[PDB]
């Protein structure tokens, strides 16, 4: 509940970034992290300058210290695990702004909605413990118990909102302090619903609602473009496949320990471990990521390119050629 201090704002305005270019598609954040030994003020100040850069904080009436402000509310409320950490955000962050400024994706959308989307990504994933939904349900865990009794199978998705309203509810951390009415209610109901979007068991019918609105936009603008800001959340949440194999290797390495750090504890409460969980397996990262993109990622992205994103051909051409360096991993063994 505490305050930001003046010496938590300096230590993330010092940070310079000399050799990288935070818009690029090719911005690799774990050569960020490297090149410092204070990695989570490199990746506040990575989000402050990306946001900053926009001018649309300043458009929208946010002050430069209630912006970062924001940002280190939402770093003080990320956990020390593999993969679901402050560094995953800023990664969806900087993500969704290349979709939006490299494939031409702001065309679609307004100004404000381009401004929620950049935010949502930072508050995706607040207080993530490295279980999945799946876990707190199976293991009748308190926080599974409340879902049930509630309605709500999005056990994370729902304590993820929880977590950006009681940010937001403080006037010193509210990036949308200056719209008012419409404006204002837009900025929270596309946030959440975007948010909510992100749960896996919804994937399905995220998509097929995406492509039903893009294939008759002028008759519900309302429902197309609330349904693009889902779809870009989403395209965001699984982009590891998209970037330069080496990013893309290091992301399915950290998930991967997450998964057996689950399974583990699955088995310690002697529940029912699914084989991509059991460390015990003969592991096998490229098997796991040729199926993830088969039956997965390269579905979702030329589904949604050929519909009308046309600017994010690039995502298709890179999963087909991580794909291709998985194949020649598994010919070579
Ligand atoms: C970098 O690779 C990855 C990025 C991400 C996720 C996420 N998975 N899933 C679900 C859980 C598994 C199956 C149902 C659909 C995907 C989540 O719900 C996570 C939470 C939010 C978004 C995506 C996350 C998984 C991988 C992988 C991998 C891998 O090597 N083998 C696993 C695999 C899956 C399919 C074939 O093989
Ligand atoms: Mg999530
Ligand atoms: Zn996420």
């Not at 003080?76 to 290349?98: A, G, L, S």
């Not at 009681?166 to 975007?194: K, N, Q, Y």
Request: net charge negative; aromatic share 10%; glycine share 4%.
């Amino acid at each position: 509940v505490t305050a930001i201090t003046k010496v938590e704002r300096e230590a993330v305005l010092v940070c310079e970034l000399p050799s990288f270019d935070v818009t690029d598609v090719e911005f690799d954040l774990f050569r960020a992290r490297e090149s410092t030994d204070k990695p989570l003020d490199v990746a506040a100040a990575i989000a402050y300058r990306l946001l900053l850069g926009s001018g649309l904080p300043q458009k929208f009436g946010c002050s430069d210290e209630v912006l970062l402000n924001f940002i280190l509310q939402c770093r003080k409320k990320y956990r020390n695990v593999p993969y679901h950490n402050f560094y995953h955000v800023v990664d969806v962050c900087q993500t969704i702004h290349t979709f939006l400024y490299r494939g031409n994706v702001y065309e679609k959308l307004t100004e404000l909605e381009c401004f929620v989307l950049l935010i949502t990504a930072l508050v995706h994933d607040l207080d993530h413990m490295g279980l999945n939904n799946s876990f707190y349900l199976k293991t009748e865990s308190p926080l599974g118990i409340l879902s049930s009794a509630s309605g709500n199978t999005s056990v994370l998705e729902v304590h993820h909102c929880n977590l950006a309203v009681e940010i937001l509810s403080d006037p010193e951390s509210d990036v949308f302090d200056g719209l008012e009415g419409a404006e204002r209610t837009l900025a929270f109901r596309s946030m959440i619903d975007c948010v909510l979007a992100t749960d896996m068991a919804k994937h399905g019918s995220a998509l097929e609602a995406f492509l039903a609105s893009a294939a008759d936009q002028s008759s519900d603008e309302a429902a197309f473009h609330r349904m693009t800001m889902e779809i870009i959340l989403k395209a965001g949440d699984i982009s590891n496949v998209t970037k330069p194999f080496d990013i893309s290797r290091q992301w399915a390495m950290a998930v991967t320990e997450e998964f057996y750090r689950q399974g583990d504890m699955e088995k310690e409460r002697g529940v029912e471990v699914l084989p991509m969980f059991d460390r015990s397996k003969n592991m096998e990262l490229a098997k796991g990521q040729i199926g993830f993109i088969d039956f997965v990622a390269a579905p979702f992205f030329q589904k949604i390119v050929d519909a009308c994103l046309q600017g994010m051909q690039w995502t298709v051409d890179r999963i087909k050629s991580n794909r291709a360096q998985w194949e020649r991993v598994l010919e070579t063994r």
